[PDB]
Scaffold this motif. Structure first.
Motif, short mmCIF file in Angstrom:
data_model
loop_
_atom_site.label_atom_id
_atom_site.label_comp_id
_atom_site.label_asym_id
_atom_site.label_seq_id
_atom_site.Cartn_x
_atom_site.Cartn_y
_atom_site.Cartn_z
N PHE A 521 0.80 -1.22 0.00
CA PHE A 521 0.00 0.00 0.00
C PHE A 521 0.83 1.27 0.00
O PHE A 521 0.26 2.36 0.12
N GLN A 522 2.15 1.18 -0.13
CA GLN A 522 3.00 2.37 -0.13
C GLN A 522 2.72 3.22 -1.36
O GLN A 522 2.78 2.73 -2.49
N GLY A 523 2.42 4.50 -1.14
CA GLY A 523 2.13 5.41 -2.23
C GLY A 523 0.68 5.41 -2.65
O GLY A 523 0.14 6.45 -3.04
N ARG A 524 0.03 4.25 -2.57
CA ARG A 524 -1.36 4.11 -2.96
C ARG A 524 -2.28 4.46 -1.80
O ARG A 524 -2.00 4.14 -0.64
N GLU A 525 -3.40 5.11 -2.12
CA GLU A 525 -4.39 5.51 -1.14
C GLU A 525 -5.74 4.91 -1.49
O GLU A 525 -6.02 4.58 -2.64
N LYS A 526 -6.59 4.77 -0.46
CA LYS A 526 -7.93 4.24 -0.64
C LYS A 526 -8.89 5.01 0.25
O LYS A 526 -8.48 5.73 1.17
N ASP A 527 -10.19 4.86 -0.03
CA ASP A 527 -11.20 5.59 0.72
C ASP A 527 -11.25 5.14 2.17
O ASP A 527 -11.47 5.96 3.08
#
Length: 599
Positions: A521-527
């Motif tokens: 999940f590094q760098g990536r974002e989610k709601d």
């Protein structure tokens, strides 16, 4: 550590790369999938493309251009062995690779064995940069040559470089802080930019390059360790109108239109090549001209390009040698070993900018002997310890402001500003404890099982409680593509994927709910992010602050942590976390339908 000679710099990092290289050469040849299942699909260029789904060390380490050898040992078809280069290594846990030849079995879909073929090209480029850093005095500007070797060189700056409007063409305007980072970095040769989550790494970086290319008479190098971040900057830099060329090496099959091998494909300035690129649809003699015209057309596309973006291992490609790059910017410079980040630096860096977060996920070294010897220290961190205070952007436009409170105080010294109102976020069929703060800690007591065939831990009680949480977030909640369950242990992950396939919703609704470690999940974002500690005994990133910081700061609307405090209260990083959720009165225990504020 400071060094006296560039040769001393090579004598120190030389053996460090060889250790990781020799150890990476072992984890690839030894590790293999004993029995895997695949799914064939007719390719775009009529070339067979294979989709397979499947030591505990399997990692996102494989890049796009890597190749694997899929050997078939099934019982319904004769033996077959074909090689193929990867295409799309996903972050959702099915890999994809297309074979070189089209003569392969399609009837058999099971009983496959995949083995990772190791190539030395990555580390060979890393040592070719350390050698060229010691035997070549022109490989690096005289000033930053001292700052890299930790000498006592005075501070110099360049004047009359600031533009009229810092905001770039085709890009949004910059925040009070981002404009300062553009002013401060454009004024000096060697700068460091620290970009925390929500800070604009791509905007505040493409804006800098838009000026380093307009105020310069040569190509500009943009690099990144991950093959994805180089693609993000291309798309951002391309929005300015500059001439951008992506350099994909060995990826012969977004940013598929800015790629170099596609630009040289249909050129109006190479009609013989154009008539030959078309003629190649259906000769040995021509193939030489096609391969010769390609090398000629590529030079015309690079030496006149206003920006050349590629990977850090990339940019060492033999067609980028014999070139010089005055300005060099490297995004996510805190995720690459120092000799890896130095591969583009060697090409005559005169104005260097490194972007990343020291207080954030770091590089990956597999040979632990090298990680303690100093290879675990990226070029970003080592220059900070010498005394280069990074220009730090302070606005987080991604997470809810109440979510950013703890990561700011504990990790970033409280010097963070919320550039998003609490109404833009937290905006819904969900009854949070305190709706002013979409965050709580579902305290769960569940049996801790070491049920990963002796490699990881497992907590069934949390999994079921997590299952109800990810279900309520689907009962008139967000889409399953924007919910991310994050867990340190693979044994818990292997359980949640299978356990959620019980649950109220259908089997396929829970499929898009990504379940992996923080490394994915590094760098990536989610709601939404649902964190499961899993461990319940006082005896994993539950102790690391960096991997903890990423788990919190990658949720946009809501954060929910599930764990047992009597084992987490050991580490002070969690003690400040738990006591904060109690301070904010969101340390919640009890049923899910009627959550109660408990201790």
């Amino acid at each position: 550590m400071r060094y006296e000679d560039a040769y001393q710099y090579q004598n120190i990092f030389g053996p460090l790369v060889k250790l990781e290289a020799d150890y990476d050469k072992k984890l690839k040849e030894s590790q293999t999938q004993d029995n895997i299942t695949v799914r064939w699909d007719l390719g775009l260029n009529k070339k067979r493309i294979a989709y397979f789904t499947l030591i505990w060390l399997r990692d996102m380490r494989l890049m796009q251009g890597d190749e694997i050898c899929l050997r078939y040992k099934g019982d319904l078809a004769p033996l077959w062995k074909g090689i193929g280069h990867v295409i799309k290594v996903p972050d959702n846990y099915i890999a994809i690779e297309l074979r070189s030849s089209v003569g392969a079995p399609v009837e058999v879909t099971h009983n496959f064995q995949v083995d990772f073929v190791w190539k030395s090209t990555s580390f060979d480029r890393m040592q070719s940069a350390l050698k060229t850093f010691a035997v070549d005095e022109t490989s690096v500007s005289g000033y930053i040559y001292h700052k890299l070797l930790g000498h006592e060189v005075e501070d110099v700056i360049i004047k009359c470089q600031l533009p009229k409007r810092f905001t770039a063409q085709g890009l949004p305007d910059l925040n009070h802080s981002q404009v300062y980072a553009v002013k401060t970095v454009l004024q000096r040769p060697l700068s460091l930019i620290q970009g925390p989550p929500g800070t604009g790494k791509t905007v505040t970086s493409a804006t800098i390059v838009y000026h380093l290319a307009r105020q310069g008479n040569g190509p500009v190098l943009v690099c990144a360790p991950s093959n994805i971040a180089v693609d993000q900057l291309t798309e951002k830099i391309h929005q300015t109108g500059l001439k951008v060329v992506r350099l994909c090496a060995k990826s012969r099959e977004p940013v598929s239109f800015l790629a170099l091998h596609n630009q040289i494909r249909n050129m109006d300035s190479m009609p013989e090549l154009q008539k030959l690129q078309q003629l190649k649809d259906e000769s040995s003699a021509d193939e030489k001209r096609y391969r010769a015209l390609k090398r000629t057309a590529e030079r015309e596309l690079l030496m006149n390009a206003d920006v050349i973006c590629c990977t850090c291992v990339g940019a060492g490609d033999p067609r980028l040698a014999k070139m010089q790059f005055r300005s060099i910017l490297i995004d996510e410079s805190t995720q690459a070993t120092e000799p890896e980040c130095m591969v583009p630096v060697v090409l005559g860096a005169k104005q260097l900018i490194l972007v990343g977060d020291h207080c954030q996920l770091g590089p990956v070294v597999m040979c632990k002997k090298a990680a303690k010897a100093g290879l675990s220290q990226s070029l970003f961190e080592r220059l900070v310890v010498l005394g280069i205070r990074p220009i730090r952007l302070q606005v987080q436009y991604r997470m809810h402001p109440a979510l950013s409170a703890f990561p700011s105080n504990i990790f970033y010294e409280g010097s963070l500003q919320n550039g998003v109102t609490a109404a833009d976020r937290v905006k819904f069929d969900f009854q949070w404890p305190q709706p002013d703060k979409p965050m709580f800690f579902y305290v769960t007591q569940g049996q801790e099982e070491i049920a990963s065939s002796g490699t990881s831990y497992l907590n069934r009680t949390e999994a079921a409680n997590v299952e109800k949480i990810t279900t309520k977030l689907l009962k008139a909640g967000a889409k399953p593509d924007q919910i991310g369950i994050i867990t340190p242990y693979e044994g818990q992950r292997s359980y949640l994927v299978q356990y959620m396939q019980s649950g109220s919703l259908h089997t396929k609704l829970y499929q898009e709910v990504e379940i992996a470690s923080v490394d994915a999940f590094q760098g990536r974002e989610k709601d939404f992010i649902i964190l499961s500690c899993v461990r319940a005994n006082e005896h994993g990133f539950l102790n690391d602050p960096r991997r903890l910081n990423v788990a919190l700061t990658r949720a946009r609307y809501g954060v929910i942590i599930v764990g047992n405090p009597k084992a987490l209260s050991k580490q002070p990083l969690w003690n400040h976390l738990l006591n904060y959720y109690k301070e904010q009165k969101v340390l919640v225990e009890g049923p899910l339908n009627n959550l109660r504020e408990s201790l």
